[PDB]
Design a protein around this ligand. Structure first.
Ligand SMILES: Nc1ncnc2c1ncn2[C@@H]1O[C@H](COP(=O)(O)OP(=O)(O)O)[C@@H](O)[C@H]1O
Lengths: 514, 500, 197, 505
């Protein structure tokens, strides 16, 4: 009966997280410390920050966070699936089926799931060739907040991310989120957002005594710095000689002017001021003469250097420079043009040769809906990154779960051993993700999961409806949608690995008997 | 608080009868005072068996019984509508409305509902005495009681009741009665003219078409035997004289056929085969058994004196349905009493049932059928029943509430909500989420169709046009239903404290 | 929720405790300190420092009464009774569902009328010694034994006559009461000038 | 319904009932019973909210969001909790009868959107560039809260402060929340001579009798061309062995600071800025210098004070070479009042530290002023973008409810009922005002709603000072657009953040 108490504890910890599944999942209260209360609906956060004193919950959550840290998001699904199969296996134990029997059944069901998911319901990284549609659907559902303008986000994302190419083991086509720079802006009509196939920023105006204003055949990757407010102290306070720490400061300013003359002699029109510039220096050198920038984003600086095949650390030991820079920073952008673009004074750089990165400027109207826009773009870019970097995708939502449930029920009806109920009841329990998503979608689960079962049966019993295999639900809807006009998806690797870890957690927690 | 305690009784009664509202409604078992168990759908019989100690419950109970007195169709509508009305009145009093203003608003809203409900009439029973229309009209009441026998009971009620409407002015509902055939299929029931009774009649079948009935209740008695002292008698003269007395009594019967004209007679007391062959030589019939209700109803309808006297027929018992017959339809012999003239041409349904517990339920169904046939007879106008009229009245009352200023506005709004509360209860009974179906139907009623109602037989919240479906409802029945419902509701809300 | 009923009851209790104390004919009350010593008094100023107030909003009323009476200090008790009677009638009128804020508005209008009518009630005269000794007598008699009040009142009116040149208020620097234990009061009159400790 | 959700609803209703009648200009009183002794009378709801912290439901979220709204805006923001409590009470009426925890969220989002749309509709325009109007409107609005006599005095000075405060950002054209608008508790004096101070107090200058007086040009000098770091820890790190030796080793670095301060003397700037400290022994030597040394200033100080001055970053007193922001500090004044002579520096058309010239024998009037200028700050901030403001005071609630219900009448789906429920729940503010004033809550509410049903009556409402249905237009009392919209924003946001909760721990 102590294993049944383990079952009750696991069911409790699963019910804690059930309502948090899915993007429409409700938020959860959890109090690790008396001093503050945390409001989050993220499964990983709620499992990590919360703890349950019962050992079975400890084991289940430890496997869940193993899954989380080793294959990424999905820990909430792992907890829900594992504990539902756990409770259902307890139901079998009340039917006098010994725990080892349902252990063998869960192992066989996991094996058949791994075989079936990889074989019959899968896409070969091409999105069946409909990438310019699934993304169009995906942008719609990844961004509910945007609404009307829609397809333009998709038409930009598809090529702005396909323009990326990382370098890694055998060169997988993973295109990270940082490959595009999000430039929050507003003031214009909410109809467009110019993507920079390359990078963009702003610089000083009027002081542009250099050809960056026009077409540059060759560019640089150079850093920059000018100072008169005590930036560089080569000598310290160690002695009190009253007039002996002001001439080194001014002379460092003069030798920095010598440095920039050594830089401006070579030109190459890409000059970027590094951090540390005091506001006093900012208001000084707009008049005193500076080929500077207003300390543009250092993250953007690093991603620019990566997007130009040359980082200043390869020639200089720091980001300021006192030794003469080598020609390694000679940039190779095909086109650099300054334009009065989007009614702002940006610099526009095309797709720089060698390693490269993308960007976007926002043609927004007012601050807050443009913040909403800056959020939706991040969501869309990150989730499409998930889809493509997965390099293999399973139909998301409840589609794979319902298909696996029906197929495993048939397999159980065609297996014939002591663990025959184990396969079928594993299948029935595995409907918990469709059930939980339907409940969280304000819909009646008994009807939505029913439609999923009916569609998957009709799809895999009569081969005339192969495309009917790809219908699932994740979000509030009146009728479940097909994942070929729609585009809700999950990586097949993370989904199958999360299912494997849920099965393994169930096995480990049922192997503990007395 | 005293008023809320009074309302709680109607609240619990409304929740009790809510499950039984309409087709697909929850069944209920009620226990008779003699522990007899049977399941039923009729809320009227639920109230008949459910004791109601709280006075507000009794208020709603005789509201439903006055509904019985006026028109049988809609008796449960009164109870559930009054319960919803008191729910909304409880909400108003919790808000802080005075009882007087709540009553004023409810009365004015009820008056305008009465004047506007005939504007919701889609059509009328233009073609009575024709099976095609009247069977469909009866279908709604039949399904209201029993959903598994929609059209067969409707058409048998049609073909029966059409035969009891020659006068063209009106007819008496008692002229349609039911008889019992146990252990038989429900589909084997059939209509017959005049009263029929299953149980055997003594003597060979003569069926004189002018048998002016000799009317008695128990003209014969059971077995007895004298005791000379404590111990029994030892002579058969008490039996021989009894047999000869019965023989001479029926000899005087075939004498008194001159002033009585009786080829048939009825009894509740046993007779023997001696009476059998006496009847065979006298060519008469004698029904050996009937129940007390059957005997009494026969006594009134024959319009003749009835008494349990061992006496030959007399002049003061002239039979009404002198044209007597017998039948065997539904593989069961039945005696038949009929009269050829059209006025008061009573007819009966030979109800065939394998289960008495189902048998009295279909008895209640046929009673409501003849009641709604009476409703159509007194007024042919029909209204789109099935929550369509409820939402239409609710929408019109809400339009009034938004257009009429004053303190009664809340009363108007919550009376409209009480009207809305009928289709949501029907949806709860049918097995569909009430909020979504109410919202969908209410949105459909905002434009175009004025008669569309919810589809009970669909799983997803669905709303279908009522006319094309043919489950319409009575105008006058609904009018009186809301009238009595709001009257009882305002009377029970007016009382502030019950007194010992 | 008529939670103001407990506040009205507290006002009733503090009124009753401050009842029986008005006028020369009224009783006085003793404040038994935690040290066990004795303190006879009649004035409400120190009676509202009887730290056994036994109820919190009663303590509120006591401290606000002391604060608002320290400016004049001739009208402190009476204040408790007037507020107690206002709250008595207020309870009498809340008991029929009436909202207290309009009661307070009526009180404000009543105050606006009462101050104007009081401005006409007051008599204005040059403070000769007879009227001054009469007012000192009627102010002091309501706090001291009647037979002993007058010998104090003459010294009081002498003290207030000593500083008549300028409209400046009472100051302890020109009137410093000094005490010493003795067998009999025996004409507890002022002395002109200063007395040493 | 989910039992824990109903508990959150009940807690929200509890706090809502705590301060529901504590709303409006005729607010009811509340008692705080401190078990260790004492008691507080208060009708300022936020004071209760800060004190009543015994709550341990998820109403922690409501309390923290109320404190956030108080620190950002403050004036009249108590109504957000009344609105949230009423909306959650009417949410429960649906959540418990049939479970639907998410569609109610969609209904509340739609309600918030339509409320924003209708507030931007029914509102009455106001100018921000003529005295003859905003003077009247803000005078009335400020007078609503706590002022009887000083309205005409404090209003002018606070509004002029925000007018000076206007144009700070020069980008988003948004002024400070509080980074500039500080205040100094200037004590005593004739309270009526509290006048405008279009500048800021400079506290620590004149503590000694002889510090600095009346320099026009805001000169400063730093360790650039005539000053050096070798003033600091110029010989050895400080060691601790005994108090006398500790003071001697402190005065070591202090005397080297004295040496470079005596070199500062011949440089003769108006002020100087230091972050570590300055020596009073050198400060006594500043008569010919006429300089003041301000020390141990935080980055906020070295930002706002320096840019309030627009300080001249000079090397010698006979030249002008660089200013922080031009001649920002037009004037500097020391009034010969108080032991610490109050140095006031005057700046023009610039973002700057803020302080007002105030006088008072009691600090109640000297603490009302900042919560007046905060309201003035909200008024200027919303009118500079939206020249627009709202009836408010419970009057606009009926107009918003009528518009919302009118839109709902044409709305399908199950979300219709909670959306109209929000419409009805908004009526609490006029309802609580009428209940507060003792008038018939239901009768007056019905009359006001019916009159709002009539055409072009969107400004009709209740006067909280009299308890009657008279119109709020042409009566003079109004509420700011930003305050009203942000009140709805925070109310619906806390409503959704409380309904989105469906379990604890
Ligand atoms: N097939 C149907 N679909 C929708 N509504 C129906 C259907 N059949 C009957 N109804 C409605 O359901 C209502 C239920 O009323 P009811 O309480 O059963 O009347 P009574 O109990 O007096 O016979 C009826 O008035 C009828 O209009």
């Amino acid at each position: 009966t102590i294993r049944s108490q383990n079952v009750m504890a696991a069911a409790s910890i699963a019910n804690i997280v059930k309502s948090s599944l899915g993007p429409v999942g409700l938020d959860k209260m959890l109090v690790d410390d008396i001093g503050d209360v945390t409001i989050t609906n993220d499964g990983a956060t709620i499992l990590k920050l919360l703890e349950v004193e019962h050992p079975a919950a400890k084991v289940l959550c430890e496997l869940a966070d193993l899954q989380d840290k080793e294959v990424g998001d999905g820990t909430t699904s792992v907890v829900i699936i594992a504990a539902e199969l756990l409770k259902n296996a307890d139901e079998l134990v009340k039917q006098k089926i010994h725990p080892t029997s349902v252990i063998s059944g869960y192992r066989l069901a996991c094996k058949e799931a791994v075989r079936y998911i990889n074989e019959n319901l899968i896409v070969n990284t091409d999105e069946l060739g409909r990438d310019c549609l699934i993304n169009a659907a995906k942008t719609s559902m990844s961004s509910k907040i945007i609404g009307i303008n829609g397809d333009f986000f998709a038409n930009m994302v598809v090529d702005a991310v396909l323009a990326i190419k990382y370098t890694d083991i055998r060169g997988q086509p993973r295109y990270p989120v940082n490959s595009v720079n999000i430039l929050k802006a507003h003031g214009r009509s909410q109809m467009e957002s110019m993507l920079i196939s390359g990078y963009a920023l702003n610089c000083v105006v009027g002081s542009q005594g250099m050809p960056k204003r026009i077409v540059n055949a060759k560019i640089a990757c150079l850093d920059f710095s000018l100072q008169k407010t005590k930036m560089k102290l080569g000598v310290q306070v160690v002695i009190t000689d009253p007039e002996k720490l002001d001439q080194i400061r001014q002379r460092e300013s003069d030798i920095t002017k010598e440095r920039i003359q050594k830089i401006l002699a070579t030109g190459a029109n890409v000059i970027l001021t590094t951090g540390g510039i005091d506001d006093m220096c900012l208001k000084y050198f707009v008049e005193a003469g500076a080929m500077a920038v207003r300390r543009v984003l250092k993250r953007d600086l690093k991603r620019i250097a990566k997007a130009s095949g040359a980082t200043i650390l390869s020639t200089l030991a720091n980001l300021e420079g006192e030794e003469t820079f080598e020609a390694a920073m000679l940039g190779q952008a095909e086109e650099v043009v300054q334009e009065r673009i989007c009614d702002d004074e940006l610099i526009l750089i095309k797709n720089t040769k060698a390693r490269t990165s993308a960007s976007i400027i926002l043609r927004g109207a007012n601050d807050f809906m443009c913040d909403e826009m800056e959020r939706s773009l991040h969501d869309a870019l990150c989730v499409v990154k998930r889809v493509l970097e997965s390099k293999s995708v399973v139909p998301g939502g409840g589609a794979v779960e319902a298909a696996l449930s029906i197929y495993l029920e048939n397999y159980a009806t065609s297996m014939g051993s002591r663990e025959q109920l184990a396969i079928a009841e594993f299948a029935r329990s595995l409907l918990v993700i469709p059930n939980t998503l339907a409940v969280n979608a304000a819909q009646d689960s008994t009807d939505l999961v029913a439609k999923l079962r009916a569609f998957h049966n009709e799809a895999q019993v009569n081969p005339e409806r192969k495309n009917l295999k790809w219908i699932g639900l994740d979000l509030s809807n009146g009728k479940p949608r097909d994942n070929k006009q729609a585009g809700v998806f999950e990586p097949t690797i993370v989904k199958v690995k999360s299912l494997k870890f849920a099965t393994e957690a169930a096995i480990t927690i049922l192997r503990i008997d007395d | 608080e005293a008023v809320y305690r009074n309302i709680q009784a109607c609240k619990e009664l409304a929740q009790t009868t809510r499950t039984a509202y309409g087709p697909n409604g929850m069944n209920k078992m009620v226990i008779n005072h003699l522990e007899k168990l049977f399941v039923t759908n009729d809320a009227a019989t639920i109230l008949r068996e459910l004791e109601v100690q709280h006075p507000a419950a009794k208020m709603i109970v005789m509201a439903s019984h006055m509904q019985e007195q006026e028109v049988g169709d809609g008796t449960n509508f009164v109870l559930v509508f009054a319960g919803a009305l008191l729910e909304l009145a409880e909400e108003l009093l919790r808000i802080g409305l005075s009882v007087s203003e709540v009553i004023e608003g409810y009365e004015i809203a009820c008056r305008k509902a009465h004047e506007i409900l005939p504007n919701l009439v889609c059509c009328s029973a233009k073609n009575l005495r024709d099976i095609d229309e009247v069977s469909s009209l009866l279908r709604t009441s039949i399904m209201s009681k029993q959903y598994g026998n929609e059209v067969f009971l409707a058409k048998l009620i049609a073909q029966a009741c059409v035969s009891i409407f020659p006068d063209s002015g009106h007819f008496n509902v008692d002229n349609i009665r039911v008889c019992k055939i146990l252990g038989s299929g429900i589909s084997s029931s059939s209509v017959l003219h005049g009263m029929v009774f299953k149980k055997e009649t003594e003597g060979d079948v003569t069926s004189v078409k002018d048998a002016k009935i000799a009317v008695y209740s128990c003209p014969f008695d059971g077995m007895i035997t004298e005791t000379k002292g404590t111990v029994l008698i030892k002579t058969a003269e008490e039996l021989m004289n009894f047999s000869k007395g019965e023989e001479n009594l029926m000899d005087a019967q075939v004498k008194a056929i001159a002033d009585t004209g009786a080829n048939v007679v009825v009894t509740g007391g046993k007779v023997a085969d001696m009476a059998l062959h006496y009847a065979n030589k006298y060519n008469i019939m004698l029904v050996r058994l009937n129940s007390k209700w059957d005997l009494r109803r026969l006594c009134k309808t024959v319009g003749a004196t009835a008494l349990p006297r061992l006496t030959p027929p007399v002049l003061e018992e002239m039979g009404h349905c002198d044209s007597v017959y017998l039948s065997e339809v539904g593989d069961t012999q039945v005696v038949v009493f009929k009269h050829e003239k059209e006025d008061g041409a009573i007819s009966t349904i030979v109800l065939r049932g394998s289960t008495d517990n189902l048998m009295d339920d279909i008895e209640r169904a046929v009673d409501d059928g003849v009641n709604t046939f009476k409703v159509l007879t007194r007024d042919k106008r029909l209204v789109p029943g099935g929550g369509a009229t409820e939402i239409e009245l609710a929408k019109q009352i809400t339009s009034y509430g938004e257009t009429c200023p004053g303190l009664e506005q809340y009363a108007i709004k919550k009376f409209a909500e009480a009207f809305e509360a009928i289709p949501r209860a029907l949806a709860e009974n049918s097995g569909v989420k009430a909020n979504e179906v109410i919202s969908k139907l209410y949105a459909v009623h905002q434009e175009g169709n004025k008669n569309v109602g919810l589809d009970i037989e669909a799983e997803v919240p669905a709303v279908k046009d009522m006319l094309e479906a043919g489950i319409l409802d009575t105008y006058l029945g609904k009018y009186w239903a809301i009238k009595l419902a709001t009257n009882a509701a305002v009377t029970v809300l007016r009382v502030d404290q019950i007194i010992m | 929720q008529a939670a103001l009923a407990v506040n009205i009851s507290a006002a009733r209790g503090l009124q009753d405790v401050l009842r029986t104390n008005l006028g020369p004919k009224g009783t006085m009350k003793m404040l038994v300190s935690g040290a066990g010593d004795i303190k006879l008094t009649k004035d409400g100023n120190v009676l509202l420092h009887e730290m056994q107030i036994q109820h919190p909003t009663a303590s509120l009323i006591a401290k606000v009464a002391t604060a608002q009476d320290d400016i004049t200090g001739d009208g402190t008790t009476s204040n408790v009774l007037i507020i107690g009677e206002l709250l008595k009638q207020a309870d009498l009128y809340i008991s029929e569902g009436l909202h207290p804020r309009i009661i307070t508005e009526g009180f404000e209008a009543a105050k606006e009328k009462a101050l104007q009518f009081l401005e006409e009630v007051k008599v204005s005269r040059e403070m000769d010694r007879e009227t001054l000794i009469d007012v000192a007598r009627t102010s002091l008699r309501t706090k001291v034994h009647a037979e002993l009040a007058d010998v104090l009142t003459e010294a009081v009116v002498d003290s207030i006559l000593a500083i008549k040149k300028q409209d400046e208020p009472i100051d302890l620097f020109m009137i410093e009461i000094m005490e010493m234990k003795h067998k009999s009061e025996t004409d507890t009159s002022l002395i002109r000038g200063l007395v040493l400790d | 319904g989910r039992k824990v959700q109903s508990g959150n609803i009940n807690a929200a209703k509890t706090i809502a009932d705590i301060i529901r009648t504590c709303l409006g200009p005729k607010s009811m009183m509340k008692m705080l019973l401190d078990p260790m002794g004492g008691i507080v009378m208060t009708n300022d709801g936020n004071a209760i909210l800060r004190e009543i912290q015994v709550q341990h439901p998820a109403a922690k979220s409501m309390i923290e969001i109320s404190r956030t709204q108080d620190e950002e805006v403050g004036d009249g923001t108590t109504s957000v909790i009344i609105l949230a409590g009423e909306m959650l009470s009417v949410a429960e009426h649906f959540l418990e009868q049939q479970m639907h925890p998410t569609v109610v969220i969609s209904a509340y989002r739609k309600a918030l959107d339509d409320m924003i749309s209708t507030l931007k509709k029914i509102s009455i325009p106001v100018d921000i560039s003529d005295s003859d109007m905003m003077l009247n409107i803000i005078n009335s609005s400020i007078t609503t809260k706590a002022i009887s006599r000083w309205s005409s005095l404090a209003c002018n000075i606070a509004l002029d402060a925000v007018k000076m405060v206007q144009f700070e950002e020069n980008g988003r054209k948004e002024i400070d929340i509080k980074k500039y608008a500080r205040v100094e508790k200037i004590p005593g004096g004739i309270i009526e001579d509290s006048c405008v101070l279009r500048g800021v107090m400079i506290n620590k200058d004149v503590t000694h009798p002889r510090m600095r007086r009346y320099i026009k040009n805001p000169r400063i000098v730093l360790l650039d061309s005539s000053l050096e770091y070798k003033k600091g820890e110029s010989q050895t790190d400080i060691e601790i062995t005994r108090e006398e030796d500790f003071t001697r080793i402190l005065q070591m670095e202090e005397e080297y600071i004295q040496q470079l301060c005596e070199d500062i003397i011949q440089l003769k700037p108006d002020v100087v800025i230091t972050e570590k400290g300055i020596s009073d022994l050198a400060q006594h030597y500043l008569m010919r210098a006429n300089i003041t040394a301000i020390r141990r200033v935080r980055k906020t100080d070295n930002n706002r004070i320096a840019r309030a001055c627009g300080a001249r970053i000079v090397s010698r007193p006979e030249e002008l070479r660089e200013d922080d922001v031009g001649t920002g500090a037009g004037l500097l004044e020391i009034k010969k009042i108080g032991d610490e002579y109050f140095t006031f520096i005057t700046d023009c058309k610039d973002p700057k530290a803020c302080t007002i010239l105030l006088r008072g024998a009691s600090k109640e009037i000297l603490s009302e002023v900042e919560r007046n200028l905060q309201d003035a700050m909200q008024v200027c901030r919303n009118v500079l973008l939206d020249p627009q403001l709202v009836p408010g005071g419970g009057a606009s609630e009926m107009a918003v409810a009528h518009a919302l219900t009118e839109k709902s009448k044409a709305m399908t789906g199950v979300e219709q009922w909670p959306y109209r429920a929000v419409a009805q729940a908004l009526e609490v503010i006029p309802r609580t005002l009428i209940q507060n004033c003792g008038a018939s809550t239901i009768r007056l509410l019905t009359s006001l709603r019916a009159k709002h049903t009539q055409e072009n009556c969107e400004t009709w409402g209740v006067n909280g000072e009299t308890g009657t249905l008279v119109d709020m237009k042409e009566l003079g009392i109004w509420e700011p657009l930003a305050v009203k919209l942000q009140t709805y924003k925070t109310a619906v946001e806390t409503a959704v953040l409380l309904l989105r909760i469906d379990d604890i721990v």
